[PDB]
Structure formats: structure tokens, C-alpha cells
Amino acid sequence: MVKQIESKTAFQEALDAAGDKLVVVDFSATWCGPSKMIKPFFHSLSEKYSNVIFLEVDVDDCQDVASECEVKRMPTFQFFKKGQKVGEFSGANKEKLEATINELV
Numbered sequence: 001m002v003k004q005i006e007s008k009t010a011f012q013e014a015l016d017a018a019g020d021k022l023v024v025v026d027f028s029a030t031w032c033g034p035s036k037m038i039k040p041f042f043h044s045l046s047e048k049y050s051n052v053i054f055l056e057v058d059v060d061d062c063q064d065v066a067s068e069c070e071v072k073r074m075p076t077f078q079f080f081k082k083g084q085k086v087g088e089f090s091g092a093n094k095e096k097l098e099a100t101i102n103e104l105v
Contacts, residue, residue, distance in 0.1 A: 002054045015083045023053040023080040032074045034092035
């Protein structure tokens with residue numbers, strides 16, 4: 001499953017509760033074609049990688065998080081461990097998404 005993040009405070013709670021596990025954040029936009037196209041895939045990943053935390057930040061519904069995280073384009077995937085960013089790329093690239101998870105778990 002994927003937790004929808006609605007605030008900076010919810011985002012910090014998520015990062016802190018993850019312990020040392022990989023956290024994958026999909027920064028998405030409802031109006032963005034490529035965001036919608038990778039969303040099913042992102043959810044499917046969340047069900048396979050039961051040891052990994054998946055979050056979604058909608059950049060309109062939760063702009064301050066998109067902003068503090070320096071998001072410039074959607075989809076953007078950021079990767080976190082122990083509250084620290086350990087990866088990032090942009091684009092609806094499924095192969096790159098699965099690979100980066102495999103590289104960072």
C-alpha cells in the first residue's frame with residue numbers, strides 16, 4: 001500500500017517511523033499524464049516490496065512538501081533512509097524506478 005502525505009508534519013512522521021528501511025516517495029500531479037501512467041506501477045511495487053515504505057505527495061494538495069524537497073518536475077521519485085535523501089530521479093521510467101529500489105534496499 002502507499003501512504004498519501006498531506007503535510008510536512010505527516011512527511012516527517014513517515015520518515016521517522018520508517019526506522020532504517022528504504023522510503024520511496026512519488027511526487028505526483030493529478031493533471032500530469034506521465035504521473036497517472038506510472039501510478040498503478042508504483043502501487044504494485046508497494047505490494048511486492050513489503051520491507052520498503054512507499055509514500056505519495058501530490059504536489060498541489062501538498063505543495064510545501066514538494067517545495068522543501070526541491071521538486072521541479074513530475075513524476076519525481078525521492079529515496080530516503082534514516083531521514084536522509086539517498087536517491088532521486090524524475091520521469092515515468094518503470095525500469096529505472098524498480099532498479100533504484102533494488103540498488104537501495
